[PDB]
Amino acid sequence: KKYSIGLDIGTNSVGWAVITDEYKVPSKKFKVLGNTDRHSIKKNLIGALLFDSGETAERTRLKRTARRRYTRRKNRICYLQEIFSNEMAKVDDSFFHRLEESFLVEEDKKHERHPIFGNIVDEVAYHEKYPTIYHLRKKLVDSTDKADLRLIYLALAHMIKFRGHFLIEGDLNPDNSDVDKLFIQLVQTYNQLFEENPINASGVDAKAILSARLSKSRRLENLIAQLPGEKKNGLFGNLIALSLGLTPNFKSNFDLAEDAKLQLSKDTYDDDLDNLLAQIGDQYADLFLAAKNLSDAILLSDILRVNTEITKAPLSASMIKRYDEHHQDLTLLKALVRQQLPEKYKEIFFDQSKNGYAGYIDGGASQEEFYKFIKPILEKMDGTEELLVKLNREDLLRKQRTFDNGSIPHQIHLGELHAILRRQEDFYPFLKDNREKIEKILTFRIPYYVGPLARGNSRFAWMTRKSEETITPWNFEEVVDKGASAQSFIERMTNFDKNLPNEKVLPKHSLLYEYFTVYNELTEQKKAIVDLLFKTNRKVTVKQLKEDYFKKRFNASLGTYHDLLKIIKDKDFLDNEENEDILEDIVLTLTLFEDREMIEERLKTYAHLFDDKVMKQLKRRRYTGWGRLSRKLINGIRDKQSGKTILDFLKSDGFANRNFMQLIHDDSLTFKEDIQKAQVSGQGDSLHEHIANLAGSPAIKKGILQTVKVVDELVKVMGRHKPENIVIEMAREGLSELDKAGFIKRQLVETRQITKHVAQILDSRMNTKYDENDKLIREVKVITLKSKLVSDFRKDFQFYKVREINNYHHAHDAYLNAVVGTALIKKYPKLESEFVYYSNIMNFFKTEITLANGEIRKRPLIETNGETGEIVWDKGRDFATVRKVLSMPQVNIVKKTEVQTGGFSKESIRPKRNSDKLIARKKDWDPKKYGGFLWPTVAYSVLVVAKVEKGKSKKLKSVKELLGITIMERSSFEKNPIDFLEAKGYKEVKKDLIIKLPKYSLFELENGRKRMLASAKQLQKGNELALPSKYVNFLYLASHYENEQKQLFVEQHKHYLDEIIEQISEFSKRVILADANLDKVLSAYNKHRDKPIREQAENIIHLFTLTRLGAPRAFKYFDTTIDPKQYRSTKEVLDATLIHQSITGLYETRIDLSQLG
DNA sequence: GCTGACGTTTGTACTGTAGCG
RNA sequence: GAUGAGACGCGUUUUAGAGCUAGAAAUAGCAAGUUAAAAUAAGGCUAGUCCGUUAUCAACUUGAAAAAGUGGCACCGAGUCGGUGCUU
DNA sequence: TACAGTACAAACGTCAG
C-alpha cells in the first residue's frame, strides 16, 4: 500500500512522520536487540530528532588565528635570540635559559631565581632604576652609554613582542598622524557623503579642543560649540563622541526602529558597525573609517604628549612621565587619606577583592571598575579635586598596559628600535651587522594574500614557494612566490554567485555593479537622467529629478564613478565603452588586496594610463567586500528571442519596466531557463559536498543532513519501499485570471532557496531510475510546503500549537506537513509543476466559507478531486484522524547522542591551590604550584567494570562505574583504552564490555522514567507529557483567552486547568522526582487559583519547564520562582536499561546494565 | 545555558570505655 | 546570511621586582604596588614561521579505513506503546 | 558489648564561566 512522509526541518529539530493513503500514521512492532527481555516494542511512525545546533567555524577561526599569532610572536623572539645567541652567550651565558624558565618555581627552575641578572642585588637595582620597561627603553634611546646587552635584548624584545599595529602605510607623516589634518579629512568625508548641510574645519582646532586637558565630554562640547552647522545630538557630533570613545546611540540619528549603540573601544565594534551599515547604507563606510582613524589619532596625541625632543622615545617618555604622575598622585592620595579620612584605608589599598587600588593593582579590577569604586570615594571627600579631575579626564593612576595601547603604530616601535639599535651599534658590532635583520624582524608582516606559510600539510594555506628552504622575515621577499601566492589568493577568495554558480562574484563597488543597481532602482529618458544626475552627484534627490528634468532620494550610487573621476581626473575616459574592462580589473585589484606592494605590482600593469601621482593616490585608495552577483549574471547571459541582456532590459524595456528579480523570475524570458540549467553543481558532488554547497547557516545544514538520514531510515523501515510523497517545511523562526493565479502562487510557493535545495537533495537521493531515453523516472515526488498553510490549518481547525508542553510539537508539525501536502497533491493534479521539485487553495479543508458580504457558503463534507474521481479529504473522518494523531501519547523523540567536541575546558586559567581537580596547563607544570584550567569538557562517558583500590587495607573492590573521558584525554583513551584505564586506577578492566556513552545517551529506569547523559557526573530529563488534544487545545486557547466563542470555550472546561495540573503532578512524581517542587507547585496553585484563568494558563505554560526534556532550568509561577532540581549523580544509570536509538528512533538495541559486573 | 567548582552539611568505620574498696 | 587569510590590544596564570617592624602567636601595624619573562588550549609528526575548539558520530556483522550489510504483516485499542490472529 | 568520641566520605545549594 502507498505511503508518504512529512518532515519539519528546524534549526534544532527534525520532525518526521509517516502516513498511509489515509492520513493515519502506521505503528509497526520493531525488533529489539541486546540483553533485555523485550524482544519487540511497538512504536508509532511519528517522531522528532532533537540535536544541539550546528555552530559556525567562526570561534575555531578566531582560536586558530590566535594560535598562529602566538606562534609567529615567539618565532619573532626566537629570531631575536638567534641574532643575540653567541654574543649573549658571552655577555651572560645562561641569560636566555633564565628567561626561558622564568615561569617556573625555584625548585623546578634550574638556574637562579632572578631572570635578568641572576643575583638579587643587580636585579632589584634594575627594577629600582627601571620600575617600568619604558624606563629602560627611553634610557637606551636617549643615552649613549654602552648598555648591558641583556638590557638591549629586553627592550628590543619588549618591542618585537607587543609591537603595535600596521594600519599606517609607509612612513609616519603629519598627513596621516596629525589630528588636525585628519579632522580636515573627516569633514571632507562628511561633506562628500552629505553635500547638504556640510561643515568647515577652519573653526575647529582638533589639536587643542581635541587632545585638551579635559574629558571626552568637555572636548566634545567645545568642539560642537565651534562648529556653525552642527549640534551635539547630530551625526557629526555622535561620530566625534564615538571617536572619543563614548557610547553614542546612532539609532536616534538614522531613526532606526531597533536601537543602535556603538563604542570603538568595544571588542565587537566591527559586528555592530557592520549591522549599522546593513541598516543605513554602504556610503557611510569611509565616514566611519575616518572617525575610527580620528579615534586612533587622538588616542596617539593623548598617549604621546611628552615632546621634550623629536627623537626622544616619545612612547617610552610618556609611559615614564605617567609613572612620575602616578607615583606623585599615589603619594598624594595615600597622604590625603591617612591624614583627613583615617578609616577605610584597608578596603581601598589592601583588600584585593574590592575594586579599589588593592583590586586594581593587585587583584582583578579594570580601570573602569576602579574608577567606579573610587569616584564615590573622592566624592564626599575633601582636598581631592586634582585627583577627581584626573579621573574625569580618565588619567588618574593609569597602568601602562591598557586597552588603549592598540592605537600604537609599529613606526613608533621602529623609531625606538632604530634609536636603540643605532644608538648602540658602535658598542656591539653584531648590532650593526644585524640591525637590518632586527629592523626586518619588527617591520615584517606576512601579507594578507599569502596565508599560513605551510609546506603542503595545511587545509587552509595556499602559499607558493620560489625555493625549497625555511621561510623567515629576511628571505620572505624571495622564498615566497608572491605572484603565484596572490593568484592562488585570487582563486581561493573569489566567492561564487548563488544565482549563477561557478561564476566569480563582483567587487561590491564594481562599476558594472553600480550601473546595474542604479538602473535597477531607476526602473532615452533613463540615459539622460543618469548622465545629467547620477554621473554628477553621489545621491540623486527626487526634488532634483523633478527640477532638472521633469521641468523639461535614490538609494543607489555611482560612487566609484565619482571616486575615479576625482582620482584619475579625466571624465571622457570613464564614459568610454571599450574602457570598461581595464576599470573592472582596477576595481578588482583594489578590492581584493590590502597590501601596498601587491596593489602596486598589479597597478604597474596599467602604468601607462595615468600619471604617477594619481596612480599613487589610486594605489592609496582601497575598497572592501563583495556583491551577491556575477558579471555573467548582470551582463553575460542574454535572451534568445529579443537578443539583449538583463542590463539592456534594465536600460530599455518598452512601455512596461521590470526589476532585476523579475528578470530572473519572468516566465516569458529565457534567463530563468538558462539559470535553472546552470544551477547544478559542476561535474556533481557528494551528499556532504552538496550540503556544504548550500546558502545557509550550519545549523540548517545539520538539519538537512539529519533529514536525509531520517528519510533513508524511514525507507530502511517499511522494507526499502520509497514514499510516494515527501513533504518538507524549513521551519519559520477585482482579482483577474492572472491575479487569481498570482494569489495561488502567493499561497503555495516557496521563496526561500534553501528549501528548493533541500527538495533537490531529497529528490536526487530518492529518485534514481531512467527510461530507454534520457527521461527521468521519479518514484518519489518531493513537496515543498509553507508554514502559513500549516498554521492556518492549526489555527482555523482548533488544532493549536504551544511549544512549552513537550517536544512532540515538532513531530506534530511534520505530521501536519504530511497531511496538508498529501491532501493538496491529490486535490490538485495539474498543479504539480507548481509545488513539486478557486484561488484560496486552502479552502478545500473548510466546512463553511464566510464571504466578503458577511454571508456564509457551504462545502461538501467529503472533499474529492474531479480530475480523478479520487477522495482526498473526508471532513469528520480524516479531520478526526489528525486529532487522534495530535493526541496520541507515543512519539519517538531522539536526542541525537553526540560526542562533545570543542574546547578542552573553560578558558580561564585559575590560580594555584591544593585542589586535585585542576587541569595542568603544561605537562611539566604541577597545578599545585602553577594553577591551571577547570571545567574540562566531557567528550564522552565510558562504562567501566574493573577492580579499584579500596580502604586502608588496599582491597581490590569490584566496581561498575561511569567514567568521563574529557576532550583532552580522548586521544590517549582511544589510542589504548586499557592502559588509560589502568592509569586511572581501574584494574583488569573487561575490554569486550566497555561501553562508550556520548552526551545524551539514554537510560530507562523505573515506571517508564527515562534519564539522559549530560556527563559522567550529570543527568537530564527524558520523558514528556502526553496531554491529549483537548488539554493542549484548551491551554493554547486559555493562554490566548486574551471569535468570542473561543473565550467561552475557556470559561467552560474550567476543570481542565485542574486536570492538567494533576497530570503534570502525577508525571513529575513518576519521572522528575523533584518533590519539593511539586509541593510548592500544588500549594501555590491553591494560593493563586483566584487569579484569572488567562493568568493561570500563561503561568502554567511556563510551569512545563518542570517537565520539559533535557537540562533542569529555573522557571516561575506568578510571584513564585522555582529553582532547578539538578541531577548531579550517575550511580543509578549503572543498573538501568541503556538504550541505543536509531536516528529515527524506531529501531532499538537495549542493554540492561544491571546484568553487567 | 547548564556542567561543574567549591564550599557547607549531613551520613559511615575505628578506637575508646565503662562506679569502686 | 556561509567561509578564509594578516596583524593588534589587553586578560589570565606562575615567577622575578630583597618588604620592614615587632613576638609564643593561626599576622596586626606600616611600607610597597604601575613592570617584565613565559605560556595562552594538552600537545601532534609529514618537523611547517604548520596543525590542534567547524563539520561528522545510536548499536551489531564484515571491512586498516572508505564503505556495505542487520529488524514479517495486518487488526483492535492507547499513559510514552499495550494486546490478538496468520506467516516463516 | 552498646554506646561515645571522632576521623572520615557522600549530598545539597549558590557561583562560574
Numbering used by the authors: 3 to 525, 543 to 571, 586 to 766, 907 to 1010, 1039 to 1243, 1252 to 1366
Paper text:
CRISPR-Cas9 is a powerful tool for genome editing, but the strict requirement for an NGG protospacer-adjacent motif (PAM) sequence immediately next to the DNA target limits the number of editable genes. Recently developed Cas9 variants have been engineered with relaxed PAM requirements, including SpG-Cas9 (SpG) and the nearly PAM-less SpRY-Cas9 (SpRY). Here, we combine structural and biochemical approaches to determine how SpRY interrogates DNA and recognizes target sites. Here, we show that SpRY binds diverse PAM sequences by forming non-specific interactions with the phosphodiester backbone of the target DNA.
We revisited our largest cryo-EM dataset of SpRY in complex with NAC PAM DNA to search for any minor species that may represent non-productive complexes. Surprisingly, when we re-performed 2D classification using a larger particle box size, we observed a subset of particles that were much larger than anticipated. 3D reconstruction of these particles revealed the presence of a dimeric SpRY complex, with two SpRY gRNPs bound to the same DNA substrate facing opposite directions—we refer to this structure as a “SpRYmer”. Within the SpRYmer structure, the first SpRY is in the product state, with both TS and NTS cleaved. The second SpRY is bound to the same DNA molecule through its PI domain but has not initiated DNA unwinding likely due to the lack of substrate complementarity. Dimeric Cas9 has been observed during target search when two PAM sites are proximally located. SpRYmer assembly is stabilized by direct DNA linkage, and by a kissing loop interaction formed between the nexus stem loop of each gRNP which was not observed in the Cas9 dimer. This unanticipated structure further supports the propensity of SpRY to stably bind to DNA irrespective of sequence.
